[PDB]
């Protein structure tokens, strides 16, 4: 019933820039939202839950913004250590849903 | 007699009251709609918005 898409497919920007990711919904999901990061050969880890609250032990560089339909994940500064795939989870209604998580967005940092 | 509030009425023509044929039966007409409104999916939703 709920379907999402994650854009961009991939990003690339030097060490001093800011990388941003859009997670948009077919219909509004309110604040209910979560952002996940997996290193290669590593299970994903929660970074932003409720679309605003920082997780535990995560540095204060990842910003979640937006509410309802459009959500943005913005990183103030990269250090070539956040080069991984990020996903957004609906965590709102999963009665008949093909995938709670969205598309994959791999971050590439050229240092 | 009741209208005049008297037990004797003089010869003449008096207008007493009115008459109106009462309705026979009742009908109600609504469009041929059978789908029930999605109250369940809104009220019985597991999680609500902020």
Curated annotation (Swiss-Prot), chain B:
<protein>
    <recommendedName>
        <fullName>Spike protein S1</fullName>
    </recommendedName>
</protein>
<comment type="function">
    <text>Attaches the virion to the cell membrane by interacting with host receptor, initiating the infection. The major receptor is host ACE2. When S2/S2' has been cleaved, binding to the receptor triggers direct fusion at the cell membrane. When S2/S2' has not been cleaved, binding to the receptor results in internalization of the virus by endocytosis using host TFRC and GRM2 and leading to fusion of the virion membrane with the host endosomal membrane. Alternatively, may use NRP1/NRP2 and integrin as entry receptors.</text>
</comment>
<feature type="glycosylation site" description="O-linked (HexNAc...) serine; by host">
    <location>
        <position position="26"/>
    </location>
</feature>
<feature type="glycosylation site" description="N-linked (GlcNAc...) (complex) asparagine; by host">
    <location>
        <position position="32"/>
    </location>
</feature>
<feature type="glycosylation site" description="N-linked (GlcNAc...) (complex) asparagine; by host">
    <location>
        <position position="44"/>
    </location>
</feature>
<feature type="glycosylation site" description="O-linked (GalNAc) threonine; by host">
    <location>
        <position position="24"/>
    </location>
</feature>
<comment type="subunit">
    <text>Binds to host ACE2. RBD also interacts with the N-linked glycan on 'Asn-90' of ACE2. Cleavage of S generates a polybasic C-terminal sequence on S1 that binds to host Neuropilin-1 (NRP1) and Neuropilin-2 (NRP2) receptors. Interacts with host integrin alpha-5/beta-1 (ITGA5:ITGB1) and with ACE2 in complex with integrin alpha-5/beta-1 (ITGA5:ITGB1). May interact via cytoplasmic c-terminus with M protein. May interact (via N-terminus) with host bilirubin and biliverdin, thereby preventing antibody binding to the SARS-CoV-2 spike NTD via an allosteric mechanism.</text>
</comment>
<feature type="region of interest" description="Disordered">
    <location>
        <begin position="20"/>
        <end position="36"/>
    </location>
</feature>
